[model samples]
Target: VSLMEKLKWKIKCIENKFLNYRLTTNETVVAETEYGKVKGVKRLTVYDDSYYSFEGIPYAQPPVGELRFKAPQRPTPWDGVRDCCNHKDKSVQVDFIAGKVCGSEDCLYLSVYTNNLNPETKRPVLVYIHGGDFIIGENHRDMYGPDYFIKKDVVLINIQYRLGALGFLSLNSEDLNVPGNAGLKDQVMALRWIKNNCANFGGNPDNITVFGESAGAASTHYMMLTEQTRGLFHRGILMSGNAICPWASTQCQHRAFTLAKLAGYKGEDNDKDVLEFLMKAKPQDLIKLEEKVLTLEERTNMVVFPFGPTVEPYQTADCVLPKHPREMVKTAWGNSIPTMMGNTSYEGLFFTSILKQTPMLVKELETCVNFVPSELADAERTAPETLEMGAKIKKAHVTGETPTADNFMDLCSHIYFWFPMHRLLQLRFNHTSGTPVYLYRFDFDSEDLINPWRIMRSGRGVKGVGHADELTYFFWNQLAKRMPKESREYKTIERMTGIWIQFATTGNPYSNEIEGMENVSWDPVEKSDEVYRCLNISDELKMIDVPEMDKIKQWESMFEKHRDLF
Candidate 1:
């Protein structure tokens, strides 16, 4: 615990001393929020354009003690002008890679970066939610700087929400009132805060666009399906996640009990008892019980999340996600919202690192029927039909029972990332409510500094764009170093920010002509098309018939002859 305090101090020193070099002036500005006034500073974008940053503003009170597992409450009003010049504590979670507990339970804050504070002419607000496995990550300047978006006259905000057990664990106990998906509820409250006071920071209330990478993307898309976010955002950009993915399913009641068991609790595994014990347990104890609860096979298969969003067994006042995702997608709340969603070409390459960690996972897959995804697996693993389906998938996807390095990533990509996207698109096509759905596949593989493959410690020489490689092009962070001017990575940044900014400002991604993307009209996915039209993002931009669209044919065969995935 003392080590985290030292680490946080070291981090703040680094952020304040070195990172503030991007600031062009020592000039300060103050803006009034619903609670009180806050001071901000001027910062320089990559192009030397000046922008204003109001960092570490408290959007909600610390969800501590009795409020730990419940929905977020609005922040208490402060009297004086708050100095938002430094970063605040992030949500507490196990940094699995760092092998330590990091962050605080009292961490419900957000930072706002804007190009102006002019009250007369407001700009479009783009609120970004960071992506992890719903476990790690924070909304900090070092990771999610406004260097990319704020250059375009947009109000850019990177937000923080509770993670792991603290944000998502729920008993679904009618008496306890700890329904799951509290993290998503945190975002809802943050949205309400933004909506109520966006004008103070020169942001338009009506033109807010919520966007994110992976789980952040999933949360944004998830919010669209519920009535909770009806008017909160005018559009959404789901970079590589959604509410429909198999990973989004919750086994919280089981995982929660497992956590309590690890914490030396010896009570009936009923909702009330388990929750009562958990309430008294220290937050550190709850966060430290990560992944120890997962079986080896589950980990190797990348069932990595121990806790996440769940359907409340007892649906009432405090339930954020009441219906199953399948039932929720059928609702009309998300139908009218314009959405821009896509994924990288080789998202599975990123997960190949997981397979490398557990080589035995390859052997387990040899008996694919017993180890298939929960969505695809039958309750009875030995059933003839399930075996047939498993064998079919292995043969078609894995190139036999044994997965080579080559075809194994395809299975991971298809099962974990790609197929879920395909199904959601079909649903969007079926449930067309007149709003356009712009889709793309990031196909660029760069040999430059901006490529994050090495940064991720993934397999070397793993060619083709994988998961989150496209992120470096969309954000300027020190982890990837600065994008050199007149280079491929630098231009990619502009094109990405341009496309995203245009979408946030208007509903369509191509409503305005971007520099590199003016050659063709980006058509929305339609019900009539067999080969779905998609914008291909590579060195060259083109609206082409996606060849990967039909890769789902075998998956469709697996689905029709066996089971519906969603």
Candidate 2:
């Protein structure tokens, strides 16, 4: 037999073993939880260490029937050992890939991967919440694999929660039964379940750290604000999203009415009428109703998401956000927790991928900022003040009379991404006395645009690193396998994973465990640092001070002049 043929046979042997363990099977790897016993499969890690993977563990009862639009209930105990080797159904949402609404109402499940099930060897726990603009995403192993984190000796938990209208729909009804932020409540319940049962999986519940990107990051921020999550998690890491972002929270009452109107309900304009109509509609029909209520700008692909989190009624007892988010974090509500928050350099590129296609969308970009009164008027997408600020923003970013791709990306990114994130960091740093606040910017760009940004720049050349590009460094991507192990990008993956793992173990991102990053000192954000020190992660990782201060000053000066602008 030839040497090449021998290598192929050996590779096939390894692949077969991996497939058996990766897929759901009736294996003997069992862990006893508070509710019941669960059977899982064992797999070899990249380092050749054996780790157990338990998929589709129920964290909460099915949020169906009467539980719809209400807080999630604790999952009922099961009889005997349940088979949990395969992935479960995702939350009900519009699956853009399949071109339809998919998943089930019984979707409050979580996936766990652990190296040590021994109670004596309690390892650090990291719970990841996937991002889909609070509308899409599931806990499938394909999107978020444990290939990297499991090697760091930490237990990994990926959770699934309700999405879109099913999770965040709110009505201005007198009854507290139909209160909004049901999705956020679902997350809180999941955390409670993890705290109680994680110890059985060799996880230290008290040392748990919550981390996420985009809407998931915003969810992490919201968890810090509410009193319900007092001891749920110790530390947090928010990437590319915050609770203060304009699109994060919305005035959902009118949108709810519009949805009811589109579903063929012609009854009197009351909360009861709207609730009755929506509750009876099919899940797929409810997903289809989003387009009819969207604005002209949104319909043309100028905007991405429509439904999101909403502020609850003022007097309701079951309120998610009783006061404004800005006011909620201003006082001592969220200052006690140690946090790490940051964004990508070109966050606006995510929007420009759509806006660049149609020049008319680019021409009429001012209308995109107009928003209603439930949120801050200036930050509202449809407010007159926002339109006024939008014109000034164009004047500053645009070089000449006409807007180009370069200037347009700059304008949208600052308004939508950079400004709000910086303001949030400033607020948290100023309020928290001793707690540390680490800030960073993911400036790395890949040679092959095979990351999520590839959809925007398939044929085009490398537009700088777009939003969520940082995810490639932490998670496993098929395209990443093509690159050589000795390449700079691979080194970045190693370094970035070490930093996150250190942060999960300790509150600080810098630790002795980080080998290549020993020289890098990730300082916490402080009022004394005039330039606002930030750790810039890329091929060349270094600490820099306010790289884009000029554009930031423009927004700062505008807000200064118009005191009530924001």
What does each candidate score in C-alpha RMSD?
3.6, 5.9
- Indicate which candidate wins on lDDT: 1
Candidate 2 Cα lDDT to native: 0.73
TM-score, cand. 1 vs. native: 0.92
Question: Against the hidden reference, what TM-scores do the models get?
Answer: 0.92, 0.88
The residue pairs that clash in candidate 1, if any, are: none
What candidate 1 gets wrong by more than 4 Å, as runs, is 1-17, 21-24, 295-303, 364-367, 370-376, 399-402, 451-461, 511-513, 562-566
The deviation in Å at residue 244 for candidate 1 is 0.9
Candidate No. with top TM-score: 1
Candidate 2 all-Cα RMSD? 5.9
Write the residue-wise lDDT of candidate 1 on 1-566 in tens digits. 13544464456547655656756578889999999999888887656777888887888888987887888888899988999877888888765335578899878888998877884578899999988878878876656777878768888888899998999887856677787888988888898899998888989999999998888888888778877877777998888888888787675766788788898899978888888888899887888887687766666556657788888777755456778777788774766888888888888777666777876666645646743556666665777767776776677566644577657677777777767778887776666666788888888887564432234444446677888888777776655456577777777778788888888998888743565886768988777767777788887777887656665655656578444454
Residue 358 miss distance in model 1 (angstroms): 2.9
